[PDB]
Design a protein around this ligand. Structure first.
Ligand SMILES: O=C(CCCS(=O)(=O)NC(=O)CCCCCCCCCCCCCCCc1nn[nH]n1)NCCOCCOCC(=O)N[C@@H](CCC(=O)N[C@H](CCC(=O)NCCOCCOCC(=O)N[C@@H](CCCCNC(=O)CSCCO)C(=O)O)C(=O)O)C(=O)O
Lengths: 100, 267, 582
């Protein structure tokens, strides 16, 4: 079977302008495991990102946590961009500043 | 109820270049303590478990057992032919129970669908698809494989689980309460969305609810995910009429709080 | 026609029952004490019927069939005994061989913490036999190759210590020194026996006999070679039997060997007279520890017989092991202060030289300088221990262990930190055990003790191997193990661990530990640093460890400790990368 990723974007600590923090992109519920994730700062890919091990849930679907150190400011927009066999084109989710 | 040790195993038949054909994550309840992949070939501790007060050869025993499973999983693809690509997953582990008893788990899935298990009283792999039979016989015909699987689930897993409970108790009994924020934003015309957010908490069990005039206003719509250190994030959103935002508050329940915490709108 | 009746008569019921209890505790280390006493008592009741009538049912069966059969009544529980359960599906002799493969050289069994003297003395008084059986059970299950007849002697001295001290005025001042001496003798005794068993089982009778020839020649230099060889053959059967789990035969034959020796002192040694007047168990123990006899006053040089004489290749070819044996015997009797493992290296070197040269064009020329080859074999060990004892006295115990920890992580980065920490602790004890000896005895002490630490490493690595270089050093040749490990350079095939945001993930629980407990954390960190850069210098490593210690100090004083740890861990990661030069 195939399963399309769910994508959430959120910070590790409550965001405050000018304070170091981490930004998460959590992609879950997908199958097969091949997937492409980029974190973006004002549309540009962030190089200094890391991720957790690809693991999976009881329903056998995969999940994966990407994250990057960042210092949010009022002006900057951050986003996560995901491609997967189940998607015709990359899906971009914007950081909602913890207000969906 | 009872916390368990489970191994999440995956093998893929056509890995992207420079990515592992086989990899394992090991979990003590909701915490990942173990990582293994076929490119590196050793099992290694994760996170705070690097510092666990552990016995000599514990980790080389984890490495030894997963190398055997690595080969078995890759052999399974040979027993299939078909055409592929294939994904083979296994969930193997145990959970402690009553009268100092262990309950094992041994399930497998192919390209995302469960198709096979290991019967621990009989020591056999079984399933109904042609693929379960093909893989199960190939494994059955492997000298000592069923014996090693029996020992892995009936002996090693519960012994590992009991050791980590004693020696990793600081990690298992970690408590970190959420930092809370309540925010509103406009939505459809005449409506606003209220979002109650919980940052950096452990353990993962958490409830968010909205109140108005001290009485239940609703749970809202929620989501949930991990941070890199194995703490968690959660949020819940409620749609309300514009102008009513300040009438609502958010209440959170978590093991890390002396009592439910009420959270008020921020401007 | 009945071995169980035969062994029961030779040994007597008390020693029979004690050895049978030891046997079960060593095979089934996880089994509760009361189950073992029931089984030992049943076999012994059974044993009594075979003496009464050497023909009653099952009295004709082999010892391994009888004992194995009982074990497989309970050892069928895979939950408790692991892969051992697979042994009960097979027949003798493989069933027995399978059980020996699964003897656990590292049982994870609770430390045995000593109670107060008064509580133990009451337990002793309340039920003396049960108290002493418990002593055998606890020692045997933690040391499944403990030399069983010697364990009997430990138990007798342990019983004697309680008998005397629990009636003394200062009980603890009488008792605790005595229990500590036995505790310490037992691990040493246990470690040596583990090495004897590894040589017989992994290398074979010839390798063991070479060791015994050398050692007996040191202690009994006035005996003729024919008498030593006889003693070596006797002793080889004893240890073969103990190491094969044949404990009743081992003890029986060891007693016979002890009587032969005492009935032939004039052919063996002048130090045996009083020993040979002691009781049975004490007699055997005294003989094994007796001081070396004096060597003959004026011995010729070895040149005549083994280098210059022209028959060497003639004598060698018709009985190579007797000739190499005679060389070992002559070299060993002249050098009671050489370590035996070094002597065996000399003899193996000599063997290697004669194999090539006795094939050669002019044999006498080819091997005329063979004794020169011994000088480097003596020089390397002596220099090793001079520097290490120099290092040990400058640095002290804890920092010396840390130096070896770094050294061995570089050598075997595939081992886990707990394994490396424990190896370095054991190696470091060779420091304080031997470096305090007189100059001349420092090197023999060390080669012997290091050979027992490495064997303990090797027998565990064999069960769960992770370094090909370790497998090579452990299986290549018993006598060259220590030089092989010394020569290991930093392992450049090891792919370093990568740094990431979670490399130093701590919780607030580390702030509540004792500094002793903190020490293993620092050591574990030191392993992890090496694994992130195997070629790191001492200076890079000290800098990163100093950062580590400040990180712990900063966050454990902090108002929000868990939060401090989340915020500073990744800062420590970046600081650590820089310290190591990335
Ligand atoms: O050395 C040996 C043994 C070798 C055997 S072996 O198998 O080959 N063992 C080994 O090789 C072990 C070596 C260890 C291995 C070495 C390997 C080393 C490798 C090193 C290099 C490699 C490094 C190793 C590293 C390992 C490794 N592996 N991987 N990495 N590392 N043997 C020595 C010599 O051989 C034997 C010599 O034989 C000589 C002999 O024959 N001896 C005889 C002598 C007789 C004797 O004394 N016997 C006694 C018996 C006791 C006794 O008291 N007997 C007397 C009682 O008899 C009665 C006599 O008295 C009665 C009496 O009163 N009167 C007699 C008179 C009769 C008249 C007869 N007349 C005559 O004879 C003359 S005629 C005169 C007329 O003019 C009456 O009865 O009436 C005894 O000693 O027991 C002997 O028997 O011993």
């Amino acid at each position: 079977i195939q399963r399309t990723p769910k994508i959430q974007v959120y910070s590790r600590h409550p965001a405050e302008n000018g304070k170091s923090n981490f930004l998460n992109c959590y992609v879950s519920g997908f199958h097969p495991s091949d997937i492409e994730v980029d974190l973006l700062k004002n549309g540009e890919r962030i190089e200094k990102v890391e991720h957790s091990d690809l693991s999976f849930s009881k329903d056998w679907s995969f999940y994966l946590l990407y994250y990057t150190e960042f210092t949010p400011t009022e002006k900057d927009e951050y986003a996560c961009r995901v491609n997967h066999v189940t998607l015709s084109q990359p899906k971009i989710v914007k950081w909602d500043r913890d207000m969906h | 109820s009872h916390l368990s040790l489970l191994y999440h195993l995956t093998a893929v038949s056509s890995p992207a270049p420079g990515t592992p054909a086989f990899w394992v994550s090991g979990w003590l309840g909701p915490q990942q303590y173990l990582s293994y992949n076929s490119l590196r070939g050793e099992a290694e501790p994760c996170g705070a478990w690097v510092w666990e007060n552990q016995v000599s050869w514990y980790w080389e025993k984890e490495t030894t057992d997963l190398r055997i499973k690595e080969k078995l999983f890759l052999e399974a693809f040979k027993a299939l032919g078909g055409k592929g690509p294939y994904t083979l997953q296994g969930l193997l582990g145990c959970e402690l129970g009553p009268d100092n008893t262990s309950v094992p788990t041994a399930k497998f899935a192919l390209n995302g669908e469960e198709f096979m298990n290991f019967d621990l009283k009989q020591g056999t792999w079984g399933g109904d698809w042609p693929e379960a039979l093909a893989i199960s016989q190939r494994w059955q015909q492997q000298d000592k494989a069923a014996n090693k699987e029996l020992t892995f689930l009936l002996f090693s897993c519960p012994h590992r689980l009991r050791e980590h409970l004693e020696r990793g108790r600081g990690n298992l009994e970690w408590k970190e309460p959420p930092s809370m924020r309540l925010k509103a934003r406009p939505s459809s015309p005449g409506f606003s969305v209220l979002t109650c957010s919980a940052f950096s908490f452990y353990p993962p069990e958490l409830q968010l609810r909205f109140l108005r005039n001290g009485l239940a206003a609703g749970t809202g719509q929620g989501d949930f995910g991990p941070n890199s250190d194995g703490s968690f994030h959660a949020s819940s959103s409620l749609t309300v009429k514009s102008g009513d935002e300040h009438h609502y508050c958010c209440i959170v329940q978590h093991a890390g709080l002396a009592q439910p915490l009420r959270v008020e709108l921020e401007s | 026609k009945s071995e169980v009746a035969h062994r029961f008569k030779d040994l007597g019921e008390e020693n029979f029952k004690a050895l049978v209890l030891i046997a079960f505790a060593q095979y089934l280390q996880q089994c509760p004490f009361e189950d073992h006493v029931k089984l030992v008592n049943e076999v012994t009741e059974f044993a009594k019927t075979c003496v009464a009538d050497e023909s009653a049912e099952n009295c004709d069966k082999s010892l391994h069939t009888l004992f194995g059969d009982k074990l497989c009544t309970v050892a069928t529980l895979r939950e408790t005994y692991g892969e051992m359960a697979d042994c009960c599906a097979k027949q003798e002799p493989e069933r027995n061989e399978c059980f020996l493969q699964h003897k656990d050289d590292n049982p994870n069994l609770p430390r045995l913490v000593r109670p107060e003297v008064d509580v133990m003395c009451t337990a002793f008084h309340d039920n003396e036999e049960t108290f002493l059986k418990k002593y055998l059970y606890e020692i045997a299950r933690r040391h499944p190759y403990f030399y069983a007849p010697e364990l009997l002697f430990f138990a007798k001295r342990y019983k004697a210590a309680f008998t005397e001290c629990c009636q003394a005025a200062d009980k603890a001042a009488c008792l605790l020194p005595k229990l500590d001496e036995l505790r310490d003798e037992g691990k040493a005794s246990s470690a040596k026996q583990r090495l004897k068993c590894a040589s017989l089982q992994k290398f074979g009778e010839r390798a063991f006999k070479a060791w015994a020839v050398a050692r007996l020649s040191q202690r009994f230099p006035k005996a003729e070679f024919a008498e030593v060889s006889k003693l070596v053959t006797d002793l080889t059967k004893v240890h073969t039997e103990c190491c094969h789990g044949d404990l009743l035969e081992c003890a029986d034959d060891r007693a016979d060997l002890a009587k032969y020796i005492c009935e032939n002192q004039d052919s063996i040694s002048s130090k045996l007279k009083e020993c040979c007047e002691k009781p049975l168990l004490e007699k055997s123990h005294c003989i094994a520890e007796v001081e070396n006899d004096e060597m003959p006053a004026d011995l010729p040089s070895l040149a005549a017989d083994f280098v210059e004489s022209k028959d060497v290749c003639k004598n060698y070819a018709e009985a190579k092991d007797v000739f190499l044996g005679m060389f070992l015997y002559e070299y060993a009797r002249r050098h009671p202060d050489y370590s035996v493992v070094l002597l065996l290296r000399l003899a193996k070197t000599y063997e290697t030289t004669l194999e090539k040269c006795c094939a050669a064009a002019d044999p006498h020329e080819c091997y005329a300088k063979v004794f020169d080859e011994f000088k480097p074999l003596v020089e390397e060990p002596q220099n090793l221990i001079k520097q290490n004892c120099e290092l040990f006295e400058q640095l002290g115990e804890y920092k010396f262990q840390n130096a070896l920890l770094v050294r061995y992580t570089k050598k075997v980065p595939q081992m886990s930190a707990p394994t490396l920490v424990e190896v370095s602790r054991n190696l470091g004890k060779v420091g304080s055990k031997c470096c305090k000896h007189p100059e001349a005895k420092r090197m023999p002490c060390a080669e012997d003790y290091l050979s027992v630490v490495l064997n303990q490493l090797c027998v565990l690595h064999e069960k769960t191997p992770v370094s090909d270089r370790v497998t090579k050093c452990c299986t290549e040749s018993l006598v060259n193990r220590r030089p092989c490990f010394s020569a290991l350079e930093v392992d450049e095939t090891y792919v370093p661990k990568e740094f990431n945001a979670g490399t130093f993930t701590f919780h607030a629980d580390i702030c509540t530990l004792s500094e002793k407990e903190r020490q293993i954390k620092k050591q574990t960190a030191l392993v992890e640093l090496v694994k992130h850069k195997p070629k790191a210098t001492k200076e890079q490593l000290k800098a990163a460890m100093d950062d580590f210690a400040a990180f712990v100090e900063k966050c454990c004083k902090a108002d929000d400790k868990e939060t401090c740890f989340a915020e500073e861990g990744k800062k420590l990661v970046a600081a650590s990368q820089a310290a190591l030069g990335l």
